[PDB]
C-alpha cells in the first residue's frame, strides 16, 4: 500500500537511555545491515517528515530517453560505380556508455520500449544546388528477414516489417514496442555460452562467444533516403533514443567502475584506476 510518493517515516522524539538494549552494537558477518535510525544513538526531537522517494522509483529512474547510435548516409559524385547508399545498424544498446551503465545496476529487466528518432541533414561541398525535402524509411528487420542488398531492391517493399516513413522537418518520429524478449525477462548479463563443445566434435564446431546468446538478438534497423538521387549531395543522421517504460528490474549489482570495453564485461589495460589520491587523515 506504500506508494512511491508517500512521505517517509517521521522522527520520533527520544530521550536519554541507560540499558541492556544495544542497538549500536552489531555484527556484519551475518550479512545483514543494521537497521538503525537516529533515535537509536542520539536524543532526537519529533519531526513531521515530508520528503518522499517519488523521484527514485525504478520507473522514474529510467524516465529519460537516451542516445544509442548515429546512423549515416552518403552520396558520391554521380553513380560512378556506387549505389549502396543505405545504413544498416544492429540494434543493441551496448554501443554507448550512458544508457548502458544505467541498465547495469540490475541483472534482469522487463520493459515496454519507446523509441524516438531525431533526424538531421546537411550539405557537403559548397554549391548553388538545392535539395527538396526528404523522406526517410526506417525499417525494422527482425532476425531472419532478408536484409537489403541494393538501395533499390525488393526488400524495401516491406509487406510485413514495420516501417516508419519520416518526412524531414516534422516532429521527430516515435514508436512503442512491447516487451519482446524470448525469456521471462531480458538478461543484462549472461554467464555462459550458446554452444556446448562436445568431445566427439571439432573445437571449431563447438565454439562460441562467452556471454552471448539470442536472448538479446533483436534484429536490425535499416534506414534509407526514399527520394531519388539528387545532383547535390546531402548527408543525413538519425539519432535513436530509447526510453524504457513500464519497467521492472531484478537483482541489484555494483555499477560499472572502469571504462566499458566491448559488449561484454571485459576491461582494457590502462583504464583500471577509478579512484584518485586522498590521505587517510585529511578531510
Amino acid at each position, epitope marked *: 500500500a506504500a506508494t512511491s510518493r508517500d512521505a517517509l517515516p517521521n522522527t520520533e522524539a527520544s530521550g536519554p537511555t541507560h540499558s541492556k538494549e544495544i542497538p549500536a552494537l552489531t555484527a556484519v558477518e551475518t550479512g545483514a545491515t543494521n537497521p538503525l535510525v537516529p533515535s537509536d544513538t542520539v536524543q532526537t526531537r519529533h519531526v513531521v517528515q515530508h520528503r518522499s522517494r517519488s523521484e527514485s522509483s525504478i520507473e522514474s529512474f529510467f524516465a529519460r530517453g537516451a542516445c544509442v547510435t548515429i546512423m549515416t548516409v*552518403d552520396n*558520391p559524385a554521380s553513380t560512378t560505380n*556506387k549505389d549502396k547508399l543505405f545504413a544498416v*545498424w544492429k540494434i543493441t544498446y551496448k554501443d554507448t556508455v550512458q544508457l548502458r551503465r544505467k541498465l547495469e545496476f540490475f541483472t534482469y529487466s522487463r520493459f515496454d520500449m519507446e523509441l524516438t528518432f531525431v533526424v538531421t541533414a546537411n550539405f557537403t561541398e559548397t554549391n548553388n544546388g538545392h535539395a527538396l525535402n526528404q523522406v526517410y524509411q526506417i525499417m525494422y528487420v527482425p532476425p531472419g528477414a532478408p536484409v537489403p542488398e541494393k538501395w533499390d531492391d525488393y526488400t524495401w517493399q516491406t509487406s510485413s516489417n514495420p516501417s516508419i516513413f519520416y518526412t524531414y522537418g516534422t516532429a521527430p518520429a516515435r514508436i512503442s514496442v512491447p516487451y519482446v524478449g524470448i525469456s521471462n525477462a531480458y538478461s543484462h548479463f549472461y554467464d555462459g555460452f550458446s554452444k556446448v563443445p562436445l568431445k566427439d566434435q571439432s573445437a571449431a564446431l563447438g565454439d562460441s562467444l562467452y556471454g552471448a546468446a539470442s536472448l538479446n538478438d533483436f534484429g536490425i534497423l535499416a534506414v534509407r533516403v526514399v527520394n531519388d538521387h539528387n545532383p547535390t549531395k546531402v548527408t543525413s543522421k538519425i539519432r535513436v533514443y530509447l526510453k524504457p517504460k513500464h519497467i521492472r528490474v531484478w537483482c541489484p549489482r555494483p555499477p560499472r567502475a572502469v571504462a566499458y570495453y566491448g559488449p561484454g564485461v571485459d576491461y582494457k589495460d590502462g583504464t583500471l584506476t577509478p579512484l584518485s589520491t586522498k590521505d587517510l587523515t585529511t578531510y
Partner: nanobody, 120 residues
Framework: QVQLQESGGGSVQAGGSLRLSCAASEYIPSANCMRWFRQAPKEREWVASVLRGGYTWHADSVKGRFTISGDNAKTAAYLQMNSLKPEDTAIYYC???????????????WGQGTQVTVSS
C-alpha cells in the same frame, strides 16, 4: 594511434586464388564495420564491406569471386579472392568504420595496403 595491418598479398596468374588479412593492433571498441578497397590509377574503388556477422555486401565486379568473413570477436577481416583476373591487380586496403554497411572513400586514416599482382 589506431593501427590496421594488411597482409597476404602477392603475385599470381589469372584464375588463381589469394586470401588477404587485416588485423588491428589492439582491439577497437567502436569499429564493427570493416571494409576493403583497391586502386590502380589515381582512383580508389570499394571492394567489399562486412559488419559483425554475418551481413556481407559486395560490388558489381568482385561478387561471387570474392568473399569476406571476419571474426565476430577479434576486430579483423578476411578477403578470399577466387578466380582472379588481371583486372584485379591493385593495392588492397583495410579500414574500420562504425555502423556503416554502405561504402564510400571517406576514411580518416589509411594503413599501408597490400599489393596484388595478377598475371595473365
Amino acid at each position: 594511434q589506431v593501427q590496421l595491418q594488411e597482409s597476404g598479398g602477392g603475385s599470381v596468374q589469372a584464375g588463381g586464388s589469394l586470401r588477404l588479412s587485416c588485423a588491428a593492433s589492439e582491439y577497437i571498441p567502436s569499429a564493427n564495420c570493416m571494409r576493403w578497397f583497391r586502386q590502380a590509377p589515381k582512383e580508389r574503388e570499394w571492394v567489399a564491406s562486412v559488419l559483425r556477422g554475418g551481413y556481407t555486401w559486395h560490388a558489381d565486379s568482385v561478387k561471387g569471386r570474392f568473399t569476406i568473413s571476419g571474426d565476430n570477436a577479434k576486430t579483423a577481416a578476411y578477403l578470399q579472392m577466387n578466380s582472379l583476373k588481371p583486372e584485379d591487380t591493385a593495392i588492397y586496403y583495410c579500414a574500420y568504420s562504425n555502423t556503416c554497411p554502405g561504402a564510400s572513400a571517406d576514411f580518416r586514416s589509411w594503413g599501408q595496403g597490400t599489393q596484388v599482382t595478377v598475371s595473365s
